[PDB]
Amino acid sequence: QVQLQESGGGLVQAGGSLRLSCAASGTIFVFDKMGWYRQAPGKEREFVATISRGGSTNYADSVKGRFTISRDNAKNTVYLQMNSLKPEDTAVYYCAVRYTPWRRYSYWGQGTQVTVS
Amino acid sequence: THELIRNAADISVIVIYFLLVMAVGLWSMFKRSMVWWPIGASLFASNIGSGHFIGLAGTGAASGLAVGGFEWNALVLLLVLGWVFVPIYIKAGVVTMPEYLRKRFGGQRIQVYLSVLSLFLYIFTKISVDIFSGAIFINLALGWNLYLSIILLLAITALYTITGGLAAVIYTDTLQTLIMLIGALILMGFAFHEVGGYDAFMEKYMKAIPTIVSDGNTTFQEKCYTPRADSFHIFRDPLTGDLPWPGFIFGLTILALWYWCTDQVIVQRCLAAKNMSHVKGGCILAGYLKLLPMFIMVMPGMISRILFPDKVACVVPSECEKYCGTKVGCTNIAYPTLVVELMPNGLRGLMLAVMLAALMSSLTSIFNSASTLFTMDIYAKVRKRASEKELMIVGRLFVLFLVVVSIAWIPIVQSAQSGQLFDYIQSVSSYLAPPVAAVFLLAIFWKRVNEQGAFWGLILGLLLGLSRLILEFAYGTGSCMEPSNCPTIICGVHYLYFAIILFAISGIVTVVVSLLTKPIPDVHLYRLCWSLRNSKEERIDLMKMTDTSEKPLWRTVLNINAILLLAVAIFCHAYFASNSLEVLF
Ligand SMILES: CC(C)CCC[C@@H](C)[C@H]1CC[C@H]2[C@@H]3CC=C4C[C@@H](OC(=O)CCC(=O)O)CC[C@]4(C)[C@H]3CC[C@]12C
């Protein structure tokens, strides 16, 4: 079965940086839209960043300018370089994948805990 | 396996179903102008039984997903028969196609040649394939060999045709289509629960290999049993992939235009309706029904490869002969293995009964049509003074010859094109059919061709196709480890790139020969072509509708529904090509 292994949590201060990863393993295909989704403790989910196969990055308007996401070519590994951290964005982070452009988010990730200040 | 049928819960079901069908026929033996719903079921079930349960499921379990785009092209060519070609047959007073080509051109050689060609196409395509499919079903279910199943199939269809099985062919046809269409969805629901959904079905199909790959000393190749790298694409490579997208669009159209519009049983089925609204209703209903066999019959073939991989995907010849009787391949048993080994104790007998009762009616229909075609159009033009008793015994001493020739031909069907039944039927049709459609279209639309061109067009097309067909069987097709020593000039291209070349060459020959002789005046050609279809004068030639009239409301309703059906078919074609999966290295 397909499972996603991720790493890169921790604790920084207001104005630091971190690094998050995600790496599917056990499949034979190439995913289309490996992205990221965050959720504050006690609230609802929202959207963070997403990179397609050929390369078309689609950020969110409340985070654009501080986050940068890049995916390796023709394989399954996607990074996320976060810069100038605040203590407002403390949540857990998931990792979602997708087979085809019209098929609605097959597999989900476990969760990485990150809090700041 | 093969002893799962020996229980008391379904033998009674088989016996009760057969007695019900024979009682319906025996009642309708004692005590024209049909309506829209019998025509639709009669048109949708024409080739089911051996072109749906063997060919589509086997080529889905062997190649991949691209086979399912056959029925969508079939429905697009089914909407042309009702709107374009049937008022041509009504407005000229003709019943069949050689009777049209006798009134159009003249003489007496084109009709005799087309009858002699149609008998050979019957033998090569329909009769031996039906007997072979019935023997496959009986050998999987019970356990006897081939020669003890062929005579059982024949001894049951004789009892079918004695007790009036040809008169009542409307009630039983609607009943069998309804029962088969209902029972083919429960097997899909049972199959998609066993593998574990729709994503595990994609992830597990790419690892279905046999575990006995070696011979005594000849270890087999890596690419010979693993699935293809493009199994989830509809449109494939036009140079290096099987079923390439130019052939898949053009050659199938050329092969379906001959089959749906220039046949004999289908045209006399549509010509026996009550009005002109009911032909169009029957053409819309079958087009709505022909959207299902991608999801119903192709995708359970892949499930059957996933679940039982050592039978359906064998590669070593000392093991493939034990399972299916031939040393080439075993994909043909993909769908009859799923019905026996997944269904519960009740429906397992009803599905086999439905498949056999749909396989016997075709045979009787063919035996009646070929007997009429031989007695009326070839034998009665030699003697010209024959009574009725002589014609009766001549018509009854011909089907014995047909049966003997087809049973002798059978052991070439089960070893051609590396063990698949879709490729055999499509290759024989591609070698023999396309010269007829070009001469038919040029006879209808152009108005200037005459009798001196059509005959030589047909003869030269026959010479090319017969050369390729004779060279194909005497040398073989090839294999995985040892390729064939075919002359690689007439034998190199795909068999769907041959239909377009033969079509174009036949059209070029009949145009060039027809532009060098004397024409025919238009006094003889009223209401027999496309430009003069609405003349009102008289021609000096060479319960029953005759008018093609309809109310001005149901015409509008039928136009709008045909447009919606075309939109749905285009959306299906645009769905399955916009998102396909790509593997990694
Ligand atoms: C909707 C899907 C899932 C199934 C298919 C249903 C329709 C698309 C089909 C089946 C019922 C059909 C209709 C049934 C009734 C008629 C009337 C029939 O003509 C008449 O009865 C009126 C003329 C006369 O009686 O002389 C012509 C076909 C038509 C329009 C049919 C057009 C095609 C229809 C709408």
XYZ file of C-alpha atoms in Angstrom, chain A residues 4 7 10 12 15 20 26 28 31 34 38 41 44 48 53 63-65 67 69 71 75-76 104 108 111 113-114:
28
model
C 3.782 8.995 2.817
C 9.842 14.953 8.497
C 10.382 21.555 15.425
C 11.721 28.218 16.127
C 11.781 35.323 12.334
C 9.504 20.284 5.386
C 5.371 1.910 -2.774
C 4.389 2.722 -9.725
C 1.436 11.835 -9.002
C 1.397 17.041 -4.581
C -2.617 23.175 7.318
C -5.702 23.251 16.707
C -10.902 24.256 10.196
C -1.052 26.646 1.701
C 3.874 18.260 -12.686
C 1.208 33.683 2.755
C 2.562 34.668 -0.684
C 6.076 36.097 -0.575
C 6.958 30.435 1.241
C 7.892 25.099 -2.849
C 9.363 19.477 -6.642
C 9.647 11.515 -9.207
C 7.769 11.891 -5.925
C -10.124 14.750 -5.920
C -3.580 12.011 2.685
C 0.775 15.084 10.201
C 3.643 19.220 14.447
C 5.265 22.661 14.331
